Amino acid sequence: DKICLGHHAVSNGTKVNTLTERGVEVVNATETVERTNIPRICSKGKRTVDLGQCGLLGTITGPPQCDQFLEFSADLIIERREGSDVCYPGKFVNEEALRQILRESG
Amino acid sequence: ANCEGDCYHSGGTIISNLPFQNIDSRAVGKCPRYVKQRSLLLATGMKNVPE
Amino acid sequence: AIAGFIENGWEGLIDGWYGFRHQNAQGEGTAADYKSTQSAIDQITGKLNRLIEKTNQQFELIDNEFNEVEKQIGNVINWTRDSITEVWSYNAELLVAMENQHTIDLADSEMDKLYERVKRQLRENAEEDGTGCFEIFHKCDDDCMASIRNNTYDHSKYREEAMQNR
Amino acid sequence: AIAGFIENGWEGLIDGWYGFRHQNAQGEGTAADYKSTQSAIDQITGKLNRLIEKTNQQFELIDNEFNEVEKQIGNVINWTRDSITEVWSYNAELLVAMENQHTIDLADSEMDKLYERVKRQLRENAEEDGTGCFEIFHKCDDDCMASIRNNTYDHSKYREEAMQNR
Amino acid sequence: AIAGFIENGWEGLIDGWYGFRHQNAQGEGTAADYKSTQSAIDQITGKLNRLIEKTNQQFELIDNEFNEVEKQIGNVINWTRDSITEVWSYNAELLVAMENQHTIDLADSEMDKLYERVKRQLRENAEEDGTGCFEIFHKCDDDCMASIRNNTYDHSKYREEAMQNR
Numbered sequence: 317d318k319i320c321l322g323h324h325a326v327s328n329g330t331k332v333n334t335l336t337e338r339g340v341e342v343v344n345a346t347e348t349v350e351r352t353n354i355p356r357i358c359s360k361g362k363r364t365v366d367l368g369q370c371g372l373l374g375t376i377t378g379p380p381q382c383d384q385f386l387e388f389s390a391d392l393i394i395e396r397r398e399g400s401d402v403c404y405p406g407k408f409v410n411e412e413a414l415r416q417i418l419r420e421s422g
Numbered sequence: 423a424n425c426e427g428d429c430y431h432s433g434g435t436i437i438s439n440l441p442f443q444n445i446d447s448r449a450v451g452k453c454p455r456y457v458k459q460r461s462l463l464l465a466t467g468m469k470n471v472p473e
Numbered sequence: 474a475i476a477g478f479i480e481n482g483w484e485g486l487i488d489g490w491y492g493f494r495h496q497n498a499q500g501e502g503t504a505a506d507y508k509s510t511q512s513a514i515d516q517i518t519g520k521l522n523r524l525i526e527k528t529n530q531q532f533e534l535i536d537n538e539f540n541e542v543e544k545q546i547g548n549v550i551n552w553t554r555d556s557i558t559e560v561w562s563y564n565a566e567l568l569v570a571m572e573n574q575h576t577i578d579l580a581d582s583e584m585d586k587l588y589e590r591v592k593r594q595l596r597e598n599a600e601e602d603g604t605g606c607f608e609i610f611h612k613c614d615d616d617c618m619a620s621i622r623n624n625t626y627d628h629s630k631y632r633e634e635a636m637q638n639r
Numbered sequence: 640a641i642a643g644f645i646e647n648g649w650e651g652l653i654d655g656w657y658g659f660r661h662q663n664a665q666g667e668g669t670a671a672d673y674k675s676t677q678s679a680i681d682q683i684t685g686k687l688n689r690l691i692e693k694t695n696q697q698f699e700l701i702d703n704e705f706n707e708v709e710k711q712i713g714n715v716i717n718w719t720r721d722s723i724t725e726v727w728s729y730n731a732e733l734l735v736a737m738e739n740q741h742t743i744d745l746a747d748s749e750m751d752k753l754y755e756r757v758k759r760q761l762r763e764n765a766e767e768d769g770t771g772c773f774e775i776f777h778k779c780d781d782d783c784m785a786s787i788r789n790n791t792y793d794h795s796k797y798r799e800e801a802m803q804n805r
Numbered sequence: 806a807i808a809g810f811i812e813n814g815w816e817g818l819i820d821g822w823y824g825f826r827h828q829n830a831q832g833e834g835t836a837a838d839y840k841s842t843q844s845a846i847d848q849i850t851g852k853l854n855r856l857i858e859k860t861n862q863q864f865e866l867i868d869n870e871f872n873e874v875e876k877q878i879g880n881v882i883n884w885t886r887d888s889i890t891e892v893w894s895y896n897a898e899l900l901v902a903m904e905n906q907h908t909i910d911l912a913d914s915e916m917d918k919l920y921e922r923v924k925r926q927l928r929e930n931a932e933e934d935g936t937g938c939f940e941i942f943h944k945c946d947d948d949c950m951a952s953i954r955n956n957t958y959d960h961s962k963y964r965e966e967a968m969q970n971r
Contacts, residue, residue: 317496317498317608318475318497318602319495319607319618320493320602320605321477321478321584321587321606322482322491323468323478323482323486323491324467324482324486325481325482327472329470332569333463333566333569334574334577336686336689337682337685337688337689339577340573341469343467344466345464345465346521347463348462348565349442350444350454351443354436357427357435359423360423360424360425395537397538399539412880416533419533441524448534450533452531454525458558459565459694462565464572465520465576468490468513471481472481530891546877546878549701550884552701552719553719553884553888557888560726560727567734596932597932600762601762602759603759712878715878715881718882722889726892737903766929769926
């Protein structure tokens with residue numbers, strides 16, 4: 317005698333925006349911006365190298381502290397602040413370019 | 423060596439099945455796109471009209 | 474004691490997105506429609522992964538924290554990076570916003586498409602109510618209502634009776 | 640001597656966005672509808688401030704006019720700034736464009752929602768014209784038309800008369 | 806043996822985008838509608854040039870291949886250029902995507918606007934089918950169908966006959 321038609325209508329509502337003054341609210345909505353961090357380096361699956369005191373560029377010249385990684389191979393490289401590419405004092409000409417080249421070397 | 427992640431930065435690892443992140447703009451890897459907003463909510467349903 | 478979508482939604486319906494609600498001689502009922510609900514859910518659920526598209530979204534470092542690059546060029550790098558960040562923030566809020574607007578304008582379209590479907594089932598045996606209901610001009614038992622929902626309403630059977638009641 | 644929205648708009652109506660226009664035994668009239676007009680104005684007026692959103696839209700200088708920075712890096716700065724400028728120009732024209740398209744597709748939707756509303760008021764006592772009018776099959780005086788506009792049209796009263804005229 | 810747009814499209818129609826298909830006492834026919842087809846083609850064809858807008862899309866070089874600029878600043882240039890490239894790729898796919906969505910939602914709107922037009926031509930002499938057809942309750946010869954397509958259907962002539970068949 318009266319058959320009708322309708323939809324969801326949850327009780328509370330939600331937040332989301334559109335191209336208006338916040339526009340509307342909806343029944344269900346999820347997040348898109350990730351705020352959760354892991355204060356570690358999740359290295360499982362990747363062959364990882366923790367260079368430590370070996371400056372990355374050192375792996376080319378071979379100071380003492382880099383003798384560990386003279387012919388290393390890895391998918392993830394972790395530079396540490398304590399590293400240094402030299403033993404006898406001196407700089408690397410166009411150093412950061414060589415670093416960028418080396419981080420994608422495997 | 424037992425957790426699995428593909429987006430890294432100075433503060434650690436960002437694991438996320440989401441499109442955007444808010445941790446660090448300088449993050450490297452297969453990261454989400456850094457945005458300035460704390461939160462952006464997707465649809466994911468119909469408009470709500472109570473009874 | 475019954476109303477449709479034009480007035481309100483239905484907090485009662487839990488087993489679907491859209492549905493039917495009738496009151497016949499036996500009493501009030503409620504159900505759902507699989508077709509339209511799936512027709513909306515299909516388009517809506519994949520939008521996240523539509524945003525998570527990552528063609529070449531990898532990137533390495535150009536600066537470095539430990540041996541800071543020259544002050545001026547580093548300042549330029551921070552400036553450019555912040556500019557691109559503002560751009561991408563704008564693009565993210567905009568994309569979310571019109572994905573939402575499209576979701577809304579989509580969902581209530583799948584509604585009044587189902588409404589018109591039911592009308593075409595009840596071509597001349599019913600008159601529309603204004604709430605989104607349907608005043609039926611015959612006696613529609615539970616089997617008849619079910620025939621409407623399952624889309625097996627042979628209107629020619631009840632037609633002469635209904636138009637007699639007109 | 641009268642027509643509706645499907646043919647033309649109404650330069651005469653000044654006190655609203657949408658309205659009614661009837662010709663009865665007493666003569667031609669015109670009015671407005673507060674509900675739909677407000678329903679559109681609400682969504683339309685705030686769009687400017689929707690664009691003027693300024694989260695972190697402040698910025699300082701990185702270069703300077705008086706002591707020009709080194710020629711090469713300054714050239715890079717001008718190049719990057721011009722690139723971002725082209726990006727933001729594109730985004731501005733696009734945002735304006737689809738805000739406009741949404742405004743248009745919105746406004747004429749609030750129209751044929753009101754049209755269907757009036758039809759549901761006049762369920763069986765009238766037949767649609769094609770211009771957006773409504774041929775009423777009874778005698779609808781000014782009080783009756785006003786009952787339509789105020790949404791108090793008890794169609795059951797005039798129904799038997801109308802369907803007699805059918 | 807005949808159906809309309811709500812069920813399927815028509816691989817047979819070649820001389821237009823939208824059209825009519827009737828079966829009368831003489832047999833099945835098919836035609837096209839110039840008005841709606843042009844109404845869609847007009848909006849659709851220019852979208853390419855709507856994208857090819859080139860206000861200041863010229864650009865010169867800032868770097869050079871032969872005498873490479875200093876390594877660091879050149880690295881910054883490559884980084885910035887790649888960033889802008891990702892931005893413009895995103896904008897291109899998005900613009901294409903919503904130009905397409907607008908095209909689709911436009912085309913099938915020009916369809917059910919024509920459908921409602923034909924209904925307003927056949928106000929009470931026909932009842933809708935559900936497939937997008939129109940069950941006509943009189944005898945509509947080829948000249949009558951042509952009167953429908955050309956929008957010259959004086960429904961008052963066939964009205965009394967049709968409502969007699971009701």
